C-alpha cells in the first residue's frame, strides 16, 4: 500500500547515479586546479564538492532507498573531457553543472508530489536546500575572479571562505 | 631528466581509474549486503573499503601524479550486475576482486623497477601492503561465515571486528 | 661478507658531500633573496632547505656510513657565483638544483640494486621520498610567482604556506 | 595468482625458524654473561636480543606467513656448545652471528625481487631495517670493552645504553 | 654445603629446556588455530601460554640456577608434526600436554624433598600452582567445544575468557 | 655616511665563510670520534660544536651584513686530511682551530676599532665571548683525557658535561 511508482523509483535511481557520477567528474576538476592552475585551495573547494556528492549525497540516497524498499541499481559512465581555458571558466563550468543539479532536484519534488509520495517529497527536501546552498558557494568562488586581478588573490579569498563554511 | 616513462603514466592511471570503479561497484556491493541480507554490520564493512577506494586510493594516486607532473585523465564506466543467492557468495566475490588488486599492484612495482623509476616505485609500496591488508580482512570476514550458522552470528563477529580495526 | 661494494661507497660519499655543498650555497641564495630582492618570507623558504641538507640530510648519512663501516671523506669546494635577475630566477634555478637532486638519489637506488645491497637501498628510500617533497615545495613557491602580480603577495603566500608545512 | 613461490616459502620458512633458534640460543648466552661473567647488564642488553627475536621477529613472520597462505612448519634443535673465554669473546661471537642473520635477510630480499614478490618484498624490509640496527647495538656493547679497562666500567655504559634504547 | 644434588640439577634442566621446547611448540599450535581452523581468538590463547613457557617460565628457572649456582645447558629440539583434524582436538592435545607438565612438576617437587632441598623446593612450588591453573584454563578452552554449536560461538566465549583473565 | 670601510665588509666575509668551512670541518672530525674511536658522547660535543658554526655562527654574520648593507660572498673549500692517532690528539687539534678563531675574531675586533666602526665592534662582542667560551668548553674535554685512564671514563664525562652545557 505504501508501494512506491516506477516513476519515484526512476528519479531516485536517476539521481544516485548522478551523484557517483559528478563526483568523480569533479575530482577530476580538483585535480586539474591544481595541476594546471596551480590553485591547491580551489582544488580544496573542489574536492569537498566532489567528497560530498561521491559520500553523504549518495549515501543518503541508497539508505532511503532501502527504507522505502524500492530497486536501486549502479550503472554509468565517466569520460572527463573538458579543458578548461583558465580558472574562473572551470568555476563557472561547475556552477552550470549545480544548475543543473538545481534542476534534477526540483524534478524529483514535482514528481513526488504528482504520485502523492509524502514520504520521499520530504525526504527531497535534504536535496532541494542543498542544492541552493551548493550553487550559491560555487557562485562566490566564481565571483572572487570578477573581483580580483590573479590567482593568488582569488586562492586567499578561498582559504577563508573554506574556514569560514567549517565555522558552519 | 626525471620525465616519467608511459608505462608508468599509463599504470598510475589506471589505478587511479580502478579505485574510482571499484569504489562505485563496491557502494552497490554494501547495499545489496543491507538491502537484500538485512545485514547492516557486513554493510557496514563493505562501505569502509568503498569509502578507501573513492578517497584516500585515488586522492594519493592524483596528489602523487601532480607531484611528478604526468597526465592523469578520469574515464571508467560501471555497470553492476552481480547478483549473489548468498551473503557469502558476495563476500568471496569481493575476495577475488581484491585479488585482481593485489595483481595490479604488484604489475605497477614491476613496471616501475624496470624504468628505473625509484620515486614511483616508493609511492606503490603504499599500496602493495595496503593490498595484502584489504584482502586478508576480506577474507577475515568470509571465514567468519564458514565458522558460524546463521547470519546474526557473523553480524556480531563483524561488528566486534570494526570495533577492533578502528583500534588501529 | 656484509663488505659494501666500492660503487655504493662513492654514490653516498658523493651524496654526502653533495648536501653539505647545496646546503652552503643555498645558504647565499637564501641571503640574496633578503638582501637583494627584501623577500625575508622567500629567504626564510630557502634557509629552511639549507637548514635540512646541513643538518639533517648529511647526520642521516654519516650515521649509516658508520654503521656498514664504510670509509666517509669530506671534500667540497663552493663558490657561489649565480647572480638572479629576478626572485622567480632563484626558485628556478632551485628547482633545477633540486631535479639535480631527485636523480643522484634515483642513481643511488639503481647503484644499490645492481649491488644487491638491500640495506643501502632501503637507507636510500628516505632521500627517494625526500625528493621529490622538497622538489614539489619549490615547484609551488615558484608557481606562487606566476600566480601573483608583485612580490609581496608571493610573501604574504608563502608566509602561509610556510605556516602549513609546519602543521606537517 | 598471487600463489607464492616455494622460493619465498622457504626463506620464510627457515627465517621463522632462525629466530626461534637463535632467540633460545641467545637466552642461553645472557645467562653466561650473569652466571660466568657476573655481568647482569650484558645479560639485560642479550636478553633483550633473545626476547625479540622468541617474540616480535618469529610472530611478525607467522603473521604474514598467514596473510598470504602459505605453508609455515616448525623445526630446528639447539645445542649450545660455545664457551667464551671471556665477556668480549661473547658479545664478538653474537656480533657474528647477527652478520648471519643480516645475510640471511638480504639473501630474503633478493629471492623476493627475482620472483617479482613485491608483497614479500615490503615485508622484508623491516627485517632489512632491524638487521642493521640490533648489528649495531651489538657493535657498540663490544666496544665498550675495547674502550675501558674493567667489567665494572663496561657495566656501567651498559647501564646507561640500555636507558638510552628504551627512551627510542 | 649447600652444594645442590646432581638430581635436583638434572629436573631442573629438564624443566629449562621442556618450557623453551612446549614454548615453540605452542607457536606453531596458535598457527593453526588461526591458519588452518580461522580462530584468532583461540590463537590468542594458545600464544599466551606459547609466551608463558617462551617467557617467564624458562627466565624463572635459568634465574634460580645462577643464584643456588647450578649449571645450566640448553639443549633441545622441535619438529612440530601434529595435525589435528578439528580445533576442539588442538585443545585437547594441549590439555594432555598440559597434563604432562603437571606431572613433570610433581616429580620435581618430589625429587627436592627426597634430596632435603628446601630452597629448589620451594622455589617449585610456583610451577606446581601455575601447572594446575594453566590446565584449568586449557580445560575451560576445551569445554566451550562442547557447549557450543560452532567455532563463532567459541570465539566469542574465549575473547571473554582472556579479558576475564586479563582482569586477574 | 654609514658606507662601511672594505677592511671591515672583508674581516665579516671572511669570518662567514669561515664559520661554513670550520662546520663543515667539525662534522668530519665529530664522524671520525664515533667511527674511528667509538667514542659517541664526543662525536655529540663535536657535533654541537659544529651545528653551531654552520647555523647560529654563519646565520647572525649574513643577518647582520644585511643590515648595514654589505656585499656578502661565499667561497670557501674544504678538504679534511687530518688524520689522528687518538682521541685526545683529536680534540687538541680542535682546541687549537678555536685558538686560530679567537685570533681571527680579536682582529675582526681591531678592525673595528681602527675604522670607528661601532656598529660592527658591537656586534663582534657575541663573537669574542663565544671565542673564549668555546675554547674552554674544548679545553675541558682535552683535560678530560689527562685525568683519566680510558675512553669509557672520558665518555662518561663528556656525557655529565653536555647535560651541565644544557643547563646553560
Ligand atoms: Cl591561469
Ligand atoms: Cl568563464
Ligand atoms: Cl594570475
Ligand atoms: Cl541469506
Ligand atoms: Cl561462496
Ligand atoms: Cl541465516
Ligand atoms: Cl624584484
Ligand atoms: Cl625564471
Ligand atoms: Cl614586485
Ligand atoms: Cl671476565
Ligand atoms: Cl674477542
Ligand atoms: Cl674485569
Ligand atoms: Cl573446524
Ligand atoms: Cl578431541
Ligand atoms: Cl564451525
Ligand atoms: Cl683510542
Ligand atoms: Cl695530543
Ligand atoms: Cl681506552
Ligand atoms: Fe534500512
Ligand atoms: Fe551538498
Ligand atoms: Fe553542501
Ligand atoms: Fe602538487
Ligand atoms: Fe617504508
Ligand atoms: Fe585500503
Ligand atoms: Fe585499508
Ligand atoms: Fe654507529
Ligand atoms: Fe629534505
Ligand atoms: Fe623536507
Ligand atoms: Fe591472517
Ligand atoms: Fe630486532
Ligand atoms: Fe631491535
Ligand atoms: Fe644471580
Ligand atoms: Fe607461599
Ligand atoms: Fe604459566
Ligand atoms: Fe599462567
Ligand atoms: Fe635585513
Ligand atoms: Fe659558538
Ligand atoms: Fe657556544
Same mark, same amino acid.
Given at each position: 500500500?505504501?508501494?512506491?511508482?516506477?516513476?519515484?523509483?526512476?528519479?531516485?535511481?536517476?539521481?544516485?547515479?548522478?551523484?557517483?557520477?559528478?563526483?568523480?567528474?569533479?575530482?577530476?576538476?580538483?585535480?586539474?586546479?591544481?595541476?594546471?592552475?596551480?590553485?591547491?585551495?580551489?582544488?580544496?573547494?573542489?574536492?569537498?564538492?566532489?567528497?560530498?556528492?561521491?559520500?553523504?549525497?549518495?549515501?543518503?540516497?541508497?539508505?532511503?532507498?532501502?527504507?522505502?524498499?524500492?530497486?536501486?541499481?549502479?550503472?554509468?559512465?565517466?569520460?572527463?573531457?573538458?579543458?578548461?581555458?583558465?580558472?574562473?571558466?572551470?568555476?563557472?563550468?561547475?556552477?552550470?553543472?549545480?544548475?543543473?543539479?538545481?534542476?534534477?532536484?526540483?524534478?524529483?519534488?514535482?514528481?513526488?508530489?504528482?504520485?502523492?509520495?509524502?514520504?520521499?517529497?520530504?525526504?527531497?527536501?535534504?536535496?532541494?536546500?542543498?542544492?541552493?546552498?551548493?550553487?550559491?558557494?560555487?557562485?562566490?568562488?566564481?565571483?572572487?575572479?570578477?573581483?580580483? +586581478? +590573479?590567482?593568488?588573490?582569488?586562492?586567499?579569498?578561498?582559504?577563508?571562505?573554506?574556514?569560514?563554511?567549517?565555522?558552519?
Amino acid at each position: 500500500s505504501m508501494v512506491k511508482s516506477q516513476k519515484v523509483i526512476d528519479v531516485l535511481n536517476a539521481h544516485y547515479n548522478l551523484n557517483l557520477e559528478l563526483g568523480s567528474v569533479y575530482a577530476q576538476y580538483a585535480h586539474i586546479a591544481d595541476d594546471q592552475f596551480s590553485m591547491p585551495f580551489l582544488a580544496k573547494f573542489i574536492n569537498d564538492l566532489s567528497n560530498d556528492k561521491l559520500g553523504v549525497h549518495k549515501d543518503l540516497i541508497s539508505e532511503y532507498a532501502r527504507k522505502i524498499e524500492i530497486p536501486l541499481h549502479t550503472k554509468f559512465s565517466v569520460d572527463v573531457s573538458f579543458k578548461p581555458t583558465d580558472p574562473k571558466e572551470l568555476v563557472k563550468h561547475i556552477l552550470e553543472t549545480e544548475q543543473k543539479v538545481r534542476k534534477h532536484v526540483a524534478n524529483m519534488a514535482k514528481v513526488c508530489l504528482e504520485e502523492g509520495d509524502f514520504e520521499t517529497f520530504s525526504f527531497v527536501k535534504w536535496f532541494v536546500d542543498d542544492g541552493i546552498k551548493d550553487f550559491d558557494d560555487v557562485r562566490t568562488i566564481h565571483d572572487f575572479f570578477e573581483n580580483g +586581478n +590573479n590567482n593568488l588573490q582569488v586562492e586567499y579569498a578561498i582559504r577563508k571562505y573554506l574556514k569560514q563554511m567549517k565555522l558552519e
